[PDB]
Design an enzyme around this catalytic site. Structure first.
Site, PDB file in Angstrom:
ATOM      1  N   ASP A 180       0.822  -1.212   0.000  1.00 59.30           N
ATOM      2  CA  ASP A 180       0.000   0.000   0.000  1.00 59.30           C
ATOM      3  C   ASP A 180       0.859   1.265   0.000  1.00 59.30           C
ATOM      4  OD1 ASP A 180      -2.395  -1.366  -0.114  1.00 59.30           O
ATOM      5  OD2 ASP A 180      -3.274  -0.364   1.651  1.00 59.30           O
ATOM      6  N   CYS A 214      -2.254   0.557 -13.354  1.00 58.36           N
ATOM      7  CA  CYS A 214      -2.331   0.481 -11.903  1.00 58.36           C
ATOM      8  C   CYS A 214      -3.515   1.375 -11.567  1.00 58.36           C
ATOM      9  CB  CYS A 214      -1.017   0.924 -11.235  1.00 58.36           C
ATOM     10  SG  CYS A 214      -0.184   2.366 -12.029  1.00 58.36           S
ATOM     11  N   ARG A 220       3.599   2.406 -10.811  1.00 58.95           N
ATOM     12  CA  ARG A 220       3.917   0.991 -11.008  1.00 58.95           C
ATOM     13  C   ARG A 220       3.931   0.618 -12.491  1.00 58.95           C
ATOM     14  NH1 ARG A 220      -0.580  -0.829  -6.431  1.00 58.95           N
ATOM     15  NH2 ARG A 220       0.179   0.637  -4.817  1.00 58.95           N
ATOM     16  N   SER A 221       2.952   1.106 -13.255  1.00 58.36           N
ATOM     17  CA  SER A 221       2.930   0.859 -14.696  1.00 58.36           C
ATOM     18  C   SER A 221       4.212   1.346 -15.357  1.00 58.36           C
ATOM     19  CB  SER A 221       1.724   1.556 -15.328  1.00 58.36           C
ATOM     20  OG  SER A 221       0.495   1.001 -14.864  1.00 58.36           O
ATOM     21  N   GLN A 261       6.711   7.758 -10.190  1.00 61.01           N
ATOM     22  CA  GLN A 261       6.081   8.826  -9.410  1.00 61.01           C
ATOM     23  C   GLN A 261       6.912   9.314  -8.229  1.00 61.01           C
ATOM     24  OE1 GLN A 261       2.291   6.407  -8.931  1.00 61.01           O
ATOM     25  NE2 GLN A 261       1.297   8.409  -9.252  1.00 61.01           N
TER      26      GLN A 261
END
Ligand SMILES: [Mg+2]
Length: 281
Positions: A180, A214, A220-221, A261
């Site tokens: 998370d 994602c 994450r992508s 990110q």
């Protein structure tokens, strides 16, 4: 050069500095279509939009808009579609894009619920006998089989174009253990996941581009395609240490904003590529 540059950035603790320079250098192109008022409910986040020049257009074109970008990597000879997790109103659009772009694989890097909030709508069926129909795009989706492993789940899905009665098998690769907060401790399970996707044929050029998402489709992508492309380039080139991951990331950011990110995601990408190169000799 990559592994030594890694250790020197760790020693000097300058990951945020390296990451900010990428943010500053990254391309900026217009996203006029994404910002039209009629598309407000087709965007999950105000600050994550596809560039006009690389956006995926829906063919059923009364409104052709979907928040999705084609990332075309010339030297690596690989294409990816990066998109947001579908919204309550864009699940039909999502599968229309999969159909029209001729994709064979879908890669999902988030859970439907994270941090107690909905990160993505439930866009695939959970039981064989309870299929899904997307009335706006005229598609039917059936869970054919499901294989739950500790760090990921693979599902076989059948997508039927109800207009033409043609059917295709879609492979859904769901990475289920990204934490998370932060990034994984070790890249081992992410890399094993990447190689499962590869082995399925879903990334092969006979098919349309894999669809990767994602929640926002950049974090994450971005990590997933960045690691994949860098590993391909290390395999292909006469000099694998000539692969510059910061240059590859900036090239990808020509096609979709915001990929990677955080400075921790940047560091994790380095770690995945370095460890993955050891696996591919
Ligand atoms: Mg059952």
């Amino acid at each position: 050069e990559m592994e030594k540059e890694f250790e020197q950035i760790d020693k000097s603790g300058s990951w945020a500095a390296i990451y900010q320079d990428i943010r500053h250098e990254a391309s900026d192109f217009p996203c006029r279509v994404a910002k039209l008022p009629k598309n407000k409910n087709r965007n999950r986040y105000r600050d994550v939009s596809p560039f006009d020049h690389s956006r995926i257009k829906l063919h059923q074109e009364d409104n052709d808009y979907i928040n999705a970008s084609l990332i075309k990597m010339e030297e690596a000879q690989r294409s990816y579609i990066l998109t947001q997790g579908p919204l309550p109103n864009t699940c039909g659009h999502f599968w229309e894009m999969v159909w029209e772009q001729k994709s064979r694989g879908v890669v999902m890097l988030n859970r439907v619920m994270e941090k107690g909030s909905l990160k993505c709508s439930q866009y695939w069926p959970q039981k064989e006998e309870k299929e899904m129909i997307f009335e706006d795009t005229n598609l039917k989706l059936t869970l054919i089989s499901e294989d739950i492993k500790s760090y990921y789940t693979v599902r076989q899905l059948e997508l039927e174009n109800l207009t033409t009665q043609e059917t295709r098998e879609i492979l859904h690769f769901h990475y289920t253990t990204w934490p998370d907060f932060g990034v994984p401790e070790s890249p081992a399970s992410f890399l094993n996941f990447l190689f499962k996707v590869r082995e399925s044929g879903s990334l092969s050029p006979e098919h349309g581009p894999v669809v990767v998402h994602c929640s926002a489709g950049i974090g994450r992508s971005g990590t997933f395609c960045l690691a994949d492309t860098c590993l391909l380039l290390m395999d292909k080139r006469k000099d694998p240490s000539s692969v510059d991951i910061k240059k590859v990331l900036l090239e990808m950011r020509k096609f979709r904003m915001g990929l990677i990110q955080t400075a921790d995601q940047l560091r994790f990408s380095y770690l995945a590529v370095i460890e993955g190169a050891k696996f591919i000799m």
